[PDB]
């Protein structure tokens, strides 16, 4: 089954003001993925993740977390590659 | 009112040589302890995950998972080293309780081989999945014929030992299962729906319990053309929920958004939509 991926932030959106960024990524399978936060296509390495969990019917699902300020010139994303997609997909966070 | 306790383990088996596993300890949705695989440990998740229970009796779990997992990811590849191709799959296993509302323990431990059911544990016999065949058939043989106590040790966890778990997590997690965290909402544009249509976005964020209330209203009369998102997870045990509504331009001017939470004490949450409607 394909990932599906929500991107969303812990509190309003406010330029200066530090924020978390959430990508909760579920529904796939097998468990073997990539997901990446990313700050101006850059890989955020300072990132969390939930250990590795599974719904009723099998399909795995993550949740990433990370501290970020968000800035009118500052690109965030959060970014899927997995056997069941040809490239990787990218989720841009905005508002 | 139902409740659970579940130990979930993950096994991806690469090749003959070479296999991960990864294990965590789950109290309904949240997450109460991992496992170290490399110093083969609990990780206790908060303050209270020993629950009621004795460090003996919980180095004596951590023994009991040591001894499986070392049976499990052998003999697992001593097999699937005849089967290879088959390689790379992934085992799934979900084993726990749930207590009911008259406090009736049922115990469940299921199985599944590369996110298909592969067998279950009914009573006192491994059961194949009708769906899978002779693998199924195979493992079960071989649970239910070769291994001595370990059926009968799965019994007795999972029906005996797991409600007590249960309910002495509960109880020693009281302060913090029992918390009230009040959320905050904003609203935001969504993904236009069209040329002169607008999509409203009601976020609320950071509230527990789960149960919330979030509408689009125009005063008192809600918008039933509402969505309401899936409530997804936020770091550190609180809740995000987005609820949305397309509207014609010319005619988003009025709507507001009404978050209800048991947190808020009857003081709702109320945001009216100023899009460009402010010079
Ligand atoms: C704590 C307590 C826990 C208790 C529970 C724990 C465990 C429970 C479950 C365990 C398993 C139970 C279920 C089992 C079901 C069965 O049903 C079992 C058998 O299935 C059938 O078996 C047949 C085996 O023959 C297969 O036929 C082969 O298919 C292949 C396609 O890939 C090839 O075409 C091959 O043809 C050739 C060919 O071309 O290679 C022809 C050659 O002539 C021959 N050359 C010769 C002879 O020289 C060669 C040879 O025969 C092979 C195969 O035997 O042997 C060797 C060899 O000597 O060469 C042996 C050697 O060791 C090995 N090298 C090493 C280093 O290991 C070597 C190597 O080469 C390969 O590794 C890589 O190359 O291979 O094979 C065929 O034979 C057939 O397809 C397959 O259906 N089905 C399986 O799916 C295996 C298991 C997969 C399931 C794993 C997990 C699911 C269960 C998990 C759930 C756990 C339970 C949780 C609960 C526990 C707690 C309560
Ligand atoms: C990595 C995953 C870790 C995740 C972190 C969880 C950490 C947290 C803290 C969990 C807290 C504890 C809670 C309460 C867990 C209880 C309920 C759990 C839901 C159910 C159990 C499911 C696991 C699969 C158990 C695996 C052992 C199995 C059962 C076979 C063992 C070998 O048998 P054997 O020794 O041969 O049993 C036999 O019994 C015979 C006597 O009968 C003996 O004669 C034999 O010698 C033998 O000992
Ligand atoms: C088995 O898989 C591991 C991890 O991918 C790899 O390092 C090793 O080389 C593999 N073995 C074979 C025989 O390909
Ligand atoms: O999301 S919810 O409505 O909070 C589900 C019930 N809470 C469970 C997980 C946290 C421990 C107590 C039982
Ligand atoms: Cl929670």
């Known amino acids: 089954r394909t990932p599906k991926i929500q991107v969303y932030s812990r509190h309003p959106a406010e330029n200066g003001k530090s924020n978390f960024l959430n990508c909760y990524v579920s529904g796939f399978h097998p468990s073997d993925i990539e997901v990446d936060l990313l700050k101006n296509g850059e890989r955020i390495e300072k990132v969390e993740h939930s250990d590795l969990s599974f719904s009723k019917d099998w399909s795995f699902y993550l ?5 970020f300020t968000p800035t009118e010139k500052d690109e965030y994303a959060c970014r899927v590659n997995h056997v069941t997609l040809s490239q990787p997909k990218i989720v841009k966070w905005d508002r | 009112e139902h409740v659970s306790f579940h130990v979930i383990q993950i096994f991806s088996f690469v090749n003959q040589s070479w296999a991960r596993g990864q294990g965590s300890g789950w109290l309904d949705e949240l997450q109460t302890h991992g496992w170290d695989s490399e110093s083969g440990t609990i990780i206790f998740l908060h303050q209270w995950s020993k629950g009621q229970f004795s460090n003996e009796e919980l180095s004596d779990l951590e023994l009991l998972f040591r001894f499986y997992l070392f049976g499990l990811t052998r003999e697992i590849q001593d097999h699937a080293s005849q089967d290879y191709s088959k390689y790379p799959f992934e085992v799934q296993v979900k084993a726990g309780c749930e207590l009911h509302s008259g406090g009736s323990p049922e ?15 009914q009573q006192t016999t491994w059961v194949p999945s009708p769906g899978c065949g002779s693998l199924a058939q195979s493992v ?14 799965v019994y007795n966890l999972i029906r005996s030992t797991c409600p007590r778990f249960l309910l002495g997590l509960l109880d020693a997690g009281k302060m913090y299962v029992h918390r009230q965290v009040r959320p905050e909402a904003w609203l935001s544009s969504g993904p236009s729906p069209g040329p002169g249509r607008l999509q ?55 709507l507001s958004c009404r978050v209800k939470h048991s947190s808020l004490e009857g003081q709702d949450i109320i945001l009216y939509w ?5 010079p």
């Open chain 2, 107 to 121: 115990g469940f431990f299921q199985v599944a081989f590369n996110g298909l059911d592969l067998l279950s544990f």
């Open chain 1, 63 to 67: 949740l990433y977390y990370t501290e």
């Open chain 2, 200 to 254: 409203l976005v009601c976020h609320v964020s950071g509230f527990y319990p789960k149960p919330v209330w979030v509408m689009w209203m125009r005063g008192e009369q809600e918008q039933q053309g509402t969505q309401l998102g899936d409530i997804l997870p936020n770091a550190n045990g609180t809740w995000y929920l987005r609820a949305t509504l397309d509207v014609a331009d010319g005619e988003a001017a009025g």
């Open chain 2, 140 to 153: 079960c043989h071989l649970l239910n014929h070769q291994y001595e106590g370990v059926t009968e040790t």
């Open chain 2, 274 to 278: 100023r899009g460009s409607l402010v």
